[PDB]
Design a protein around this ligand. Structure first.
Ligand SMILES: O=C(O)c1cc(C(=O)O)c2c(n1)C(=O)C(=O)c1cc(C(=O)O)[nH]c1-2
Ligand SMILES: [Ca+2]
Ligand SMILES: [Ca+2]
Ligand SMILES: [Ca+2]
Ligand SMILES: [Cl-]
Ligand SMILES: [Cl-]
Ligand code: NA
Length: 557
């Protein structure tokens, strides 16, 4: 009762009352109350500075609100900004929801062709939308870059990148926006060609640049494809998460492998496949490549070196004797502070550290059991294990990890107070699925000292996790599992300090935001491609898909 009339905000058909344009400072992490990009900041940390919820009170966390989401693979993220959650659902449904109450504000529903016409169903999942200025940005299953008005959800512009639906190019991770350029990778997992990263003007929709990865006869690296004709080089894309450093003004992404996985079937025997499984640092306005490094050459294992890599500042002091250390860079600047690009880029589970500005190699370290990499030298040159390349049809090829890792898309998090990189992993191997030798627990989270490479703790549990982490200033790590358990761990020890259990597998991202001084922890759940993948190895756990939704927790008031 305000005036004598009933003022209403009809759910799904309303506007945000007060929307303030999103700035580069917001996206660099400038307002701890918000989570305006997939990993909280451009630099990829997956961290919240909010500490209302901490190791002493997290045991009291209760369900504040939840809301049903579209059916399908539910890998998305609650992108939170000034009291509104912007939520990419499966099937190109995008919602704005009041972050305090759970009331739907607006809902955009894309009109799509029937699912049967898409040769690449991976684009039906949507790990994130992006924010910039006055618009919400996403890449559609049919391969358009799309901008919606943030206040109302109405379509602003859409740009068809080409080759979606029947030709198989799509996007599953979502774009980021840097200084007015929407940057988006692609998946072309089922296509007889490679794909790209594009930059598109955020206000006009004009494509500004497009980077591809497969060299052509005449270009540097063509001689590393084993003589395979250019038209037999397939599936190399960049489907993972994009990060960015504002000060260096460098965008970071990784390309993937070539398809099929067997080099004999591809006709690339002996080829290291320049352009594949390469970490690029590029300028956002033009796509110009500044530096690059191939983290998995001659891939025969669908290793997909496209996952997020973090920009952090650390003392550089790798311990050559740390568990899993592969090598230390020849002239590492020991004892100095550097801005580094660091993390695990590929399913194989090997963590890498480079100078963020120059690409100089500092170190690499294995986590899970792996046998595709025989060694890495002091310049970061990887030598693969010839005995894991399929040659004779009758031999046993016991590869570690698997096509789901190791790691896969589920993201790591960073704890700046302890300088720890925290990564969710799977202790799996398979016949080129089973538990890796000596492991009884499929699910694993490792916490690695970014300065030394030493593993400080490891949490393990029977069920596969296959879900991102979120790190917090409250000394907590949140992580979900295939058997529906949503946990908080003590960030100092890895020990479980709280849990709940949701209707389905915890399959999407965890984010955190504050409204009126109250901290909320939002997780997307229901199921993904991974939920049922570990069943042969872990039959005893109640891993089930269903109940797709956003679920938001907070402390009692
Ligand atoms: O090669 C590719 O284009 C592409 C795309 C995707 C996708 O976009 O989600 C995955 C993979 N590859 C892949 O190799 C993989 O293991 C995988 C797991 C998932 C998932 O949703 O859980 N997506 C994908
Ligand atoms: Ca317009
Ligand atoms: Ca290099
Ligand atoms: Ca793949
Ligand atoms: Cl508009
Ligand atoms: Cl318009
Ligand atoms: Na605008």
């Amino acid at each position: 009762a305000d005036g004598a009339a009933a003022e209403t905000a009809a759910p799904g058909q309303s506007a945000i009352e007060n929307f303030q344009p999103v700035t580069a400072e917001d996206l660099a992490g400038g307002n701890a109350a918000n989570w305006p990009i997939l990993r909280g900041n451009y630099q990829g940390w997956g961290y919240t500075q909010l500490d209302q919820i901490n190791k002493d009170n997290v045991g009291q966390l209760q369900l504040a609100w939840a809301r049903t989401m579209e059916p399908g693979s539910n890998e998305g993220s609650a992108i939170a900004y000034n009291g509104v959650v912007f939520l990419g659902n499966a099937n190109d449904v995008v919602q704005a929801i009041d972050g305090k109450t759970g009331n739907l504000i607006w809902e955009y529903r894309r009109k799509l062709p029937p699912a049967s016409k898409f040769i690449n169903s991976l684009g039906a999942a949507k790990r994130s939308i992006a924010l910039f200025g006055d618009k919400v940005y996403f890449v559609s299953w049919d391969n358009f870059v799309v901008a919606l008005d943030a206040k109302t959800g109405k379509l602003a512009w859409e740009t068809n990148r080409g080759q979606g639906v029947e030709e198989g190019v799509s996007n599953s991770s979502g774009p980021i926006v840097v200084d007015g350029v929407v940057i988006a990778g692609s998946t072309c997992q089922y296509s007889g060609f490679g794909c790209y990263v594009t930059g598109t003007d955020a206000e006009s929709g004009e494509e500004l640049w497009r980077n591809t990865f497969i060299p052509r006869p005449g270009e540097e690296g063509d001689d590393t494809w084993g003589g395979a004709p250019y038209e037999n080089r397939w599936m190399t894309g960049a489907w993972g998460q994009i990060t960015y450093d504002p000060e260096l003004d460098l965008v970071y992404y990784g390309s993937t492998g070539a398809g099929p996985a067997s080099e004999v079937q591809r006709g690339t025997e002996g080829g290291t496949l320049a352009g594949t499984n390469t970490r690029f640092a590029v300028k956002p306005k033009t796509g110009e490549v500044v530096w690059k490094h191939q983290t998995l050459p001659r891939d025969n294992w669908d290793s997909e070196c496209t996952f997020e890599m973090m920009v952090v500042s650390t003392t550089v002091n790798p311990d050559a004797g740390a568990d899993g250390m592969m090598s230390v860079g020849a002239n590492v600047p020991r004892g100095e502070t550097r801005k580094v690009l660091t993390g695990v880029p590929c399913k194989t589970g090997v963590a890498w550290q480079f100078d963020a500005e120059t690409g100089d190699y500092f170190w690499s370290k294995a986590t899970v059991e792996q046998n595709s990499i025989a060694s890495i030298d002091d310049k970061g040159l990887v030598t693969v294990n010839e005995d894991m390349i399929l040659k004779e049809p009758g031999k046993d090829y016991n590869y570690c990890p698997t096509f789901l890792g190791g790691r896969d898309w589920p993201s790591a998090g960073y704890l700046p107070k302890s300088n720890l990189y925290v990564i969710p992993l799977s202790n799996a191997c398979y016949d080129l699925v089973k538990l890796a030798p000596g492991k009884t627990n499929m699910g694993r989270v490792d916490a690695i000292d970014v300065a030394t490479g030493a593993t400080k703790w490891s949490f393990e549990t029977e069920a596969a996790l296959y879900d991102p982490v979120m790190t917090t200033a409250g000394d907590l790590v949140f992580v979900g599992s295939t058997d529906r358990m949503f946990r908080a761990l003590d960030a100092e020890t890895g020990k479980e300090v709280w849990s709940t259990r949701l209707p389905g597998a915890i399959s999407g991202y965890t984010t955190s935001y504050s409204i009126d001084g109250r901290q909320y922890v939002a997780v997307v759940a229901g199921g993904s491609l991974g939920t049922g993948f570990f069943k042969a190895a872990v039959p005893g756990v109640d891993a089930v898909q269903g109940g797709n939704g956003i679920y938001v927790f907070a402390l009692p008031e």
